[PDB]
Amino acid sequence: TSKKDAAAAFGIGSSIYLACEAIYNRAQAVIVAVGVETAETPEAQASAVIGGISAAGERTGLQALLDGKSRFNAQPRLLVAPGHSAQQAVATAMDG
Amino acid sequence: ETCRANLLNNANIATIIRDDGYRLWGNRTLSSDSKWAFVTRVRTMDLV
Amino acid sequence: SFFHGVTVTNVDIGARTIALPASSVIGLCDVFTPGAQASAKPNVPVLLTSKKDAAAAFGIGSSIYLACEAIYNRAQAVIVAVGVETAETPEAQASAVIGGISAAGERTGLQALLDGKSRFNAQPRLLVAPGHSAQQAVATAMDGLAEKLRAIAILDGPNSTDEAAVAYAKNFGSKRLFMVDPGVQVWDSATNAARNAPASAYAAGLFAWTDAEYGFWSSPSNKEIKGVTGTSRPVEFLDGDETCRANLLNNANIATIIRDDGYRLWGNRTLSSDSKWAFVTRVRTMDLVMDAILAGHKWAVDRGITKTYVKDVTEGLRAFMRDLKNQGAVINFEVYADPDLNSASQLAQGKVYWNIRFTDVPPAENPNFRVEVTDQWLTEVLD
Amino acid sequence: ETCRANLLNNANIATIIRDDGYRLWGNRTLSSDSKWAFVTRVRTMDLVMDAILAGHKWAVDRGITKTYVKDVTEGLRAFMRDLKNQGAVINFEVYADPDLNSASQLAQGKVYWNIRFTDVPPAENPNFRVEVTDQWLTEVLD
Amino acid sequence: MDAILAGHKWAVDRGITKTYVKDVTEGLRAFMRDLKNQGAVINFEVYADPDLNSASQLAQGKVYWNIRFTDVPPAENPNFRVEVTDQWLTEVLD
Amino acid sequence: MDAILAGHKWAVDRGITKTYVKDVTEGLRAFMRDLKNQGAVINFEVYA
Amino acid sequence: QAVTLEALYAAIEQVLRERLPEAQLIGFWPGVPENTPAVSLEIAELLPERDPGTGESALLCRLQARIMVPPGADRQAVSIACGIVRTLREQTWNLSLQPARFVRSAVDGSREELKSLRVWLVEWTQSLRLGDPEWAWEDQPPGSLMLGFDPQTGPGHEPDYFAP
Amino acid sequence: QAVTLEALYAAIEQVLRERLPEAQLIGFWPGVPENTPAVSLEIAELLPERDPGTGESALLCRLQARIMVPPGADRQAVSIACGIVRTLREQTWNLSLQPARFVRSAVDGSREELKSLRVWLVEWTQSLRLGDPEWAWEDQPPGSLMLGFDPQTGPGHEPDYFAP
């Protein structure tokens, strides 16, 4: 909900805090951020952005936003994956 | 309207907000119906 | 609880304010010799705001400073001057004035006047290439440039006989072309004698003086030219003859310089084939109220078509024409949102149509007086 | 129209157009439907479908009476009435379905209502049709 | 917009009675009137909005007030229009 | 005849609409109306 | 709410069978004079009136009653006619109507068959609001609710609606 | 602009086929009672009115409707008549007219054939401005223009006109 909490959770220099700084410099909004680790191959980093249900049965990646209302009572009504959205693989998950 | 205090009142939870903690913030019960949301209406109804 | 607390909002639903884009910027493109005394590159636009700045940029005695001296001795205007270098042949001199684009994607000749708004926030309204507008190649590329800037490209015919000017003005048929035929004979302090000026920048200063004195709706076709000492090949206007040599050139849509010592401009008509856009007043006022509306309604490009949106565009558009009506620019107007075009389908596509009908002030180029004697009141000397 | 901004908006792509990029430019979503080719209509339909459908937990089976329809619909029209004077909706109507509420389906116990509303469209092309006439020239006589 | 925002933090859970909307509005008219005779604004119009204070908006604890006013614009271009006439030229006769 | 025929260069094919006849004829009657009060024509009629 | 002619035709038959047991057979368009004390209702003429300010059609209908009887029972047929006239002084027929105005009762000569020679025309007028009102633009159905939206409803859209 | 009788005859046929689907056959001068629920429009009488100050002829026409039906469907023919009367309260027929005034509805005895015994006369009046106005002395044709002069035009002069 603030620029302090976006830097306390992900740290400065993270590619997702740079996205949160882009929002909080213009507006003041509620961000349900997932945050993933950097993959070696960029052909599978898009599969790490999407993800899905894990081995334990927990949603990982971009699909973890579906558990935003059941956990934080704030349904994400604006889906933004900055950077990795210029592929047909990840943007079809953004449409689904 | 995106503060951390307002997101708990939006989830029907009252809070204590200010510096030195000197305000109660939130008048809503845990009602599923939007009719009995306010704790004023639940209190005045049981009194009359 | 959507929000628990005070919500102070700024609704921003009022009507806006439409201003005019100053109507008096002069585009200039004439040759000059670059060097140490001239602080201007030979193709870039320079924003000249004073007579000392035109001398510091292009050098005293240059062929473009002499055109800036013509404007600043009559009026006080903003000159977006390009400046070019002298070509060896006069057939290829027209290619340097027109210019086009460079190898690095930069407009060079007259086309550099399109950068007058993007660089200096001063869009030229008078397109003047003095001395080179007598060629048909430059004037055809200056009329097409005047449709990009909504400007009045001021021409000047050759300083030969009057049939050479009638045959030159027959080629154009465009409503953004104002032509002044007789060459001004002006004093040249470089040779200590009287030279023949192309008489285009002297009419440019007359347009930029009446906008600061009588308004943009006023024709400069009766006002004095200051800097001249005479006129090459003097034209004749005696008193009231409709068969004079001056009136036959205004009848062929060519302005002239008439009187003894050459101190009047005579003619307010463009080279228009249509009789609607004949007067240079109507062409000038139309481009000024079409550019004030276009550059003044950039706030309303995604505001959302509500009932109070169209009501607060119209009432902000009615106040623009009303502030022109009592100012003297228009006579009356009727601003109304079109009911026959703002349908439920055209609104759903994001298209809203407004109609601004108005009448301009025509210049009274022929005041008639019908004098008669009678004997109606002859029996009134009886008591 | 020869600019590369309008040649990019015609592919339903928002742009950033001004000198040193200081505003957005475009309302189009990437839709193949002409109706849903506006980011305002998609954002408002999905926000009033979520408001109405996720706001009827109290309307579960709890003694459905004759006054059940007067409690849902007049609490549904008053929500859409709050949207109209807020500026969200130009025109609306919450009407019973005329072609579906039949006498043979009334015995099934399932009546039908329709919630239509006209979303506020963004004024992406404010045309102005300015002309010079000679109508009021005779007004200059006295 | 910040005098109203930081000055009405007493009215967050008072309860919508007829004297509440009376004393918020008439406490807001006196703020703009004290700005009018000080010289900050020219005139104003403070009123509870009828169409936005619906029976369903008030039931959620939402009550709307409208504050319309006009600023004092800086006279950056004072125009003076001088004319020399001959209307009072016959006044030098008596 | 020289005034009317050599005065319709603007009336070339440029989107002939329903308002084309109201623009030619009412600009043609108003020319003949200027001839009547000038004294050139006793009586006129521009009729279909 | 508002009235209909089919609701009006049944209620005039309804009350007259209750109040008049000596009338063997009441109908709004009968025939076949099968027995002596028969009563045949009719319609003579329906006329306009002062139109109210809504979409109602003001109509006064000459509700005509014809009492067919064979000759020799002349006194027995006026007693049938006296039962109808004493009804019509205040009668609104329990239908939110104005009271009916009695007009006349006399022996006439029918165009029809004259096996039953003696016929008594009994006609009366009462106003009708048959036009549908514009005071309310909807109906009141009881049951469970289904909610749909703008470009997805009609009779060819069953799974669009919801019912939580 | 102004109305014509041929535009009026088609529009009364037009609306009544749209609003009344139970009416099998609507026509302004039909015949041949081929089946039971037939409706035959007529013309009874056209009367003058207060003449306006232009060249219009004010006329109120008794537009007559006759509902022919075989006997045994007496109730089914008043329901046809009730659909017409409820229409005529505000109806201007989308023709820039005054609303029609309902006059009467009753059983009559026709001069015509009586295979369909029961007929219901439905007549109504509405005003007409049939006379051509003198407010404008010309027409509005769309197309390209041709201009001629005084002693050189008419139908026998094609190459006189010009079109620059």
* Residue D33 exposed, middle or buried by CB count within 10 Å (0-12, 13-18, 19+): exposed
The verdict on E9 touching B (C-beta cutoff 8 Å) is no
Please give the Cα distance from C304 to C310 (Å, whole number): 10
Please give the Cα distance from C63 to A27 (Å, whole number): 56
Specify which residues C359 forms β-bridges with: C332
Quick one: CA torsion of C349, C350, C355, C356, rounded to 10 degrees?
Answer: -150
Chains G and D, touching by 3 or more CB pairs within 8 angstroms: yes
The verdict on A77 touching D (C-beta cutoff 8 Å) is yes
Q: Are C140 and C240 in contact (CB under 8 A)?
A: no
Phi, psi (rounded to 5 degrees) for C273: -75, -35
The verdict on H107 touching G (C-beta cutoff 8 Å) is yes
The verdict on C274 touching F (C-beta cutoff 8 Å) is yes
Residues of H in contact with F4 (CB under 8 A): 147
Residues of G in contact with H104 (CB under 8 A): 45-47
Please give the Cα distance from A91 to A86 (Å, whole number): 7
Amino acid identity, residue D96? A
Q: Mark H18-32 as b/e (b = at least 16 C-beta within 10 Å).
A: eebeebeebebebee
Residue appearing with tokens 């049938």: G80
Alpha helix ranges (H) inside chain A: 3-10, 17-24, 42-50, 69-72, 88-95
Q: Do G153 and D97 touch (CB under 8 A)?
A: yes
Residues of D in contact with A75 (CB under 8 A): 50
Closest CA relative to residue D120, chosen from D91, D85, D94, D97: D91
Closest CA relative to residue C123, chosen from C301, C265, C290: C290
Experimental method: cryo-EM
Tokens encoding E27:
């406490």
**Cα of B48 to nearest chain A Cα, Å:** 34
Please give the Cα distance from E81 to E27 (Å, whole number): 44
Please give the Cα distance from C206 to C215 (Å, whole number): 12
Tokens encoding D86:
């807020």
Residues in contact with C104: Cβ distance below 8 Å, sequence separation at least 6, in sequence order: none
Residues in contact with A88: Cβ distance below 8 Å, sequence separation at least 6, in sequence order: none
- Chain A residue with CA closest to D42: the answer is A77
Resolution (A): 3.5
Tokens encoding E57:
């908006």
List chain F gaps (C–N > 2.5 A) by preceding residue: none
C78 CB neighbour count, 10 Å cutoff:
19
The verdict on C273 touching F (C-beta cutoff 8 Å) is yes
Residue B32 DSSP class: S
- Chain A residue with CA closest to D29: the answer is A95
Q: Are D79 and D51 in contact (CB under 8 A)?
A: yes
Give the strand pairing for D24-25 and H26-27: unpaired
User: Which chains border E (3 or more CB–CB pairs < 8 Å)?
Assistant: B, C, D
Please give the Cα distance from G23 to G38 (Å, whole number): 7
Q: Do G131 and H103 touch (CB under 8 A)?
A: no
Please give the Cα distance from C103 to C116 (Å, whole number): 20
| Opening angle at CA H68, ends H64 and H70, nearest 5 | 165
Please give the Cα distance from C100 to C123 (Å, whole number): 18
Residues of D in contact with A77 (CB under 8 A): 46-47
Alpha helix ranges (H) inside G40-141: 74-87
Tokens encoding H98:
């005054």
Q: Do G43 and H78 touch (CB under 8 A)?
A: yes
* Residue E55 exposed, middle or buried by CB count within 10 Å (0-12, 13-18, 19+): exposed
Please give the Cα distance from C223 to C235 (Å, whole number): 17
The DSSP result for B6-24, as a single string, is HHHHTTT--EE-STTS--E
Amino acid identity, residue H64? Q
Q: Are G88 and G115 in contact (CB under 8 A)?
A: no
* Residue D131 exposed, middle or buried by CB count within 10 Å (0-12, 13-18, 19+): exposed
Residues of H in contact with F22 (CB under 8 A): 140
* Three-state DSSP class for residue H142: coil
Quick one: CA torsion of C201, C207, C209, C211, rounded to 10 degrees?
Answer: -150
Residues in contact with E26: Cβ distance below 8 Å, sequence separation at least 6, in sequence order: none
Q: Are B40 and E59 in contact (CB under 8 A)?
A: no
Please give the sequence-ordered ranges of beta strands (E in DSSP) within chain H, or none if there are none: 26-27, 38-48, 58-69, 101-107, 118-129
The verdict on C332 touching F (C-beta cutoff 8 Å) is no
Tokens encoding E76:
């950056």
Please give the Cα distance from D116 to G135 (Å, whole number): 21
Closest CA relative to residue F5, chosen from H162, H144, C275, C277: H162
Residue H90 DSSP class: T
Please give the Cα distance from C30 to C38 (Å, whole number): 14
Please give the Cα distance from F2 to C257 (Å, whole number): 30
Closest CA relative to residue C45, chosen from C21, C64, C63: C64
- Chain E residue with CA closest to D79: the answer is E56
Q: Do F7 and C275 touch (CB under 8 A)?
A: yes
Residues in contact with E57: Cβ distance below 8 Å, sequence separation at least 6, in sequence order: D82, E63, E64
**Cα of D39 to nearest chain A Cα, Å:** 12
Phi, psi (rounded to 5 degrees) for G47: -120, 155
Please give the Cα distance from D121 to D90 (Å, whole number): 9
Q: Helices G74-87 and G5-19: crossing angle, nearest 10°?
A: 120
Q: Do H106 and G131 touch (CB under 8 A)?
A: no
Residue A42: half-sphere exposure toward Cβ, Cα within 13 Å: 5
Please give the Cα distance from E18 to G98 (Å, whole number): 46
Give the strand pairing for E65-71 and E41-48: antiparallel
Residues in contact with E34: Cβ distance below 8 Å, sequence separation at least 6, in sequence order: none
The verdict on H114 touching G (C-beta cutoff 8 Å) is no
Phi, psi (rounded to 5 degrees) for C350: 85, 25
Quick one: CA torsion of G52, G56, G58, G61, rounded to 10 degrees?
Answer: -160
The verdict on E51 touching D (C-beta cutoff 8 Å) is yes
Phi, psi (rounded to 5 degrees) for C304: 90, 120
The verdict on H154 touching F (C-beta cutoff 8 Å) is no
In SS3 terms, chain C reads as CCCCCCCCCCCCCCCCCCCCCCCCEEEECCECCCCCCCCCCCCCCEEECCHHHHHHHHCCCCCCHHHHHHHHCCCCCEEEECCECCCCCHHHHHHHHHCCCCCCCCCCCHHHHHHHHHHHCCCCCEEECCCCCCCHHHHHHHHHHHHHHCCEEEECCCCCCHHHHHHHHCCCCCCCEEEECCCEEEEECCCCEEEEECCCHHHHHHHHHHHHHCCCCCCCCCCCCCCEEEECCCCCCCCCCCCCCCHHHHCCCCEEECCCCCCCEECCECCCCCCCCCEHHHHHHHHHHHHHHHCCCCCCCCCCCCHHHHHHHHHHHHHHHHHHHCCCCEEEEEEEECCCCCCHHHHHCCEEEEEEEEEECCCCCCCCCCCCCCCCHHHHCCC
Residues in contact with H51: Cβ distance below 8 Å, sequence separation at least 6, in sequence order: H57, H58
Alpha helix ranges (H) inside chain D: 6-9, 39-53, 69-86, 103-106
Residue G99 DSSP class: P
| Opening angle at CA C123, ends C120 and C129, nearest 5 | 105
